Amino acid sequence: GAMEKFKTLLYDIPIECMEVSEEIISYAKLQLGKKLNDSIYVSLTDHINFAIQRNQKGLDIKNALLWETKRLYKDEFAIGKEALVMVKNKTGVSLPEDEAGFIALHIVNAELNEEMPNIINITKVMQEILSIVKYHFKIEFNSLHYYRFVTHLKFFAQRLFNGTHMYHRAYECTKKIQTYIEREYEHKLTSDELLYLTIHIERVV
Amino acid sequence: GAMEKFKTLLYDIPIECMEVSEEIISYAKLQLGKKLNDSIYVSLTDHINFAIQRNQKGLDIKNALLWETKRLYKDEFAIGKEALVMVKNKTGVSLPEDEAGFIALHIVNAELNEEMPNIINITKVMQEILSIVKYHFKIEFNSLHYYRFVTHLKFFAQRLFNGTHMYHRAYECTKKIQTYIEREYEHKLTSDELLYLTIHIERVV
């Protein structure tokens, strides 16, 4: 019964959506080699259809985390950009760069086995940390250890939202971050979390 | 081919998930009578499974917008709460109140024909407006015209993120809101948008 009800929902998903989405997924896997949760298939397919339809209604698609996405998930954004090319050639529809950002986040989601809400929080925490650091040491980030630093932040933030666990100038920076995260997300960094941050901030700078 | 590939993905969705989700949807429709986009079916089913599995791995589920959700989407949060009862009796699993918040947002999503990222932005703008107003007139909101005000904010914010269009003390409040939205979302309120806000803020107070 259950199974049949759901079977019928697939009748509301255009085949071309399934097709272009597979092409994207397939491509993403080659470029990243990273394992993507299979949830990406129905997630992305539902998203593209929605995006295409929304665009066909003359509605705008605004991604409030576009900038962050471009700089924190370089590889994935590159794929998202390509995905819009793939979507243009298969459908003829021109989606905004904002969509490249949304597709990129769907991939990141599948990479971390997360849901959009959490990926958004994870991304904002990463960005806030980068900003606190740059503004604290008055430094300009450019990419070598940047990726390494970012990558560490990504998993640091993920552990922060799921409960997993594991020099003054750098530590004082870390303490500002603690205040930010406690106030915005109601979590207070533990000793190990502070240790982790300090070590890596110190290191990245 | 396309169609078959997707058919196989359903083999990764437990039947009980499909079942409990339908019960939730069915219930929501009676309580709200509002039309829910049918996307809610696969959206919610995928979410519950993910949530249940995440919880079964000992991972925490944190909803950064729980408080906002409780006060801005009263009816939907009520349903989410009930949904956790429904999920407990069908699966025996105790999900946190945070999940009632996530289920509530999935319903709101289906109501507005939106995707999570946008619902999050819409919700944060509504909350910021309420805060700017309360802090501007030094007023305490309690519920009569509150729902009416909130409802207006919800559609105001939605139009703001999709491109749709249409007394000093209240206007000065509206101007602070303009600054906030321009800085955080890069959109500057137009004459009509300011008009709308002023009228309703003035009114709500």
Label residue A113 exposed, middle or buried (CB < 10 Å: 0-12, 13-18, 19+): middle
How far is it, in rounded angstroms, from Cα B83 to Cα B94?
11
How far is it, in rounded angstroms, from Cα B55 to Cα B50?
8
Nearest one of B40, B46, B107 to B79, comparing CA atoms: B107
From the options 1.10.150.20, 1.10.1790.10, 1.10.3720.10, 3.30.70.100, give the CATH code of A15-114: 1.10.1790.10
How far is it, in rounded angstroms, from Cα A10 to Cα A12?
5
How far is it, in rounded angstroms, from Cα B172 to Cα A152?
44
CB A173 within 8 A of CB A201: yes
Give the helix/strand (H/E) hosting A47: helix A39-56
- How far, CA to CA in Å, does A186 sit from each of A66, A192, B168? 25, 17, 36
Whether B117 and A59 lie within 8 Å, measured CB to CB:
no
Closest approach of B17 to chain A, Cα-based (Å): 9
Instruction: Give Cβ neighbours of residue A4 (< 8 Å, ≥ 6 apart).
Output: none
How far is it, in rounded angstroms, from Cα B140 to Cα B124?
19
Instruction: Give Cβ neighbours of residue B11 (< 8 Å, ≥ 6 apart).
Output: none
Torsion of CA B19, B25, B28, B29, to 10 degrees: -130
Name residue A9's amino acid. Answer: L
Do A115-205 and A15-114 have the same topology in CATH? yes
Instruction: Give Cβ neighbours of residue A10 (< 8 Å, ≥ 6 apart).
Output: B3, B6, B7, B10
Q: How many helices (H) and strands (E) does chain A have?
A: 10, 0
How far is it, in rounded angstroms, from Cα B98 to Cα B61?
7
Instruction: Give Cβ neighbours of residue B35 (< 8 Å, ≥ 6 apart).
Output: B111
**Residues of chain A with a CB closer than 8 angstroms to some CB in chain B:** 2-3, 5-7, 9-10, 12-13, 15, 18-19, 22, 38-39, 41-43, 45-47, 50, 54, 58-60, 62-65, 102, 105, 115-118, 120-121, 161-164, 184-185, 187
DSSP B11: G
Cα nearest neighbour of B185 on chain A = A64
Ordered DSSP codes for chain A: -HHHHHHHHGGGS-HHHHHHHHHHHHHHHHHH-PPPPTHHHHHHHHHHHHHHHHHHTT-----TTHHHHHHH-HHHHHHHHHHHHHHHHHH-----HHHHHHHHHHHHHHHHT--HHHHHHHHHHHHHHHHHHHHHHT------HHHHHHHHHHHHHHHHHHT----THHHHHHHHHHHHHHHHHS----HHHHHHHHHHHHHH-
How far is it, in rounded angstroms, from Cα B90 to Cα A142?
52
Give A-chain residues touching B46 at CB under 8 angstroms: 39, 42-43
Q: Which residue has the tokens 């939605």?
A: B158
Nearest one of B121, B120, B126, B122 to B201, comparing CA atoms: B126
Q: Which residue has the tokens 């370089």?
A: A74
How far is it, in rounded angstroms, from Cα B56 to Cα A162?
12
How far is it, in rounded angstroms, from Cα A25 to Cα A42?
11
Closest approach of B3 to chain A, Cα-based (Å): 7
Instruction: Give Cβ neighbours of residue B167 (< 8 Å, ≥ 6 apart).
Output: B198, B202
Q: What are the tokens at A190?
A: 């533990």
How far is it, in rounded angstroms, from Cα B46 to Cα A39?
8
Whether B60 and A161 lie within 8 Å, measured CB to CB:
yes
How far is it, in rounded angstroms, from Cα A39 to Cα B160?
30
- Reduced 3-state DSSP string for B59-71: CCCCCCCHHHHHH
Interface test with B, best of A10, A23, A65, A90 (most B CBs within 10 A): A10
Q: What are the tokens at A167?
A: 């020099």
Whether B46 and A39 lie within 8 Å, measured CB to CB:
yes
Class of domain A115-205 (CATH, top level): mainly alpha
- How far, CA to CA in Å, does B50 sit from each of A78, B100, B146? 27, 14, 34
Whether B121 and A64 lie within 8 Å, measured CB to CB:
yes
Instruction: Give Cβ neighbours of residue B59 (< 8 Å, ≥ 6 apart).
Output: A162, A163, A164
Say which of B12, B43, B117 has its CB closest to residue A38.
B12
CB A133 within 8 A of CB A197: no
Q: What are the tokens at A200?
A: 């890596």
Domain extent listing, chain B: 15-114, 115-205
DSSP B64: T
How far is it, in rounded angstroms, from Cα B123 to Cα B106?
12
Q: Which residue has the tokens 């605004």?
A: A62
Give A-chain residues touching B185 at CB under 8 angstroms: 62, 64
How far is it, in rounded angstroms, from Cα B27 to Cα B107?
11
How far is it, in rounded angstroms, from Cα B129 to Cα B122?
11
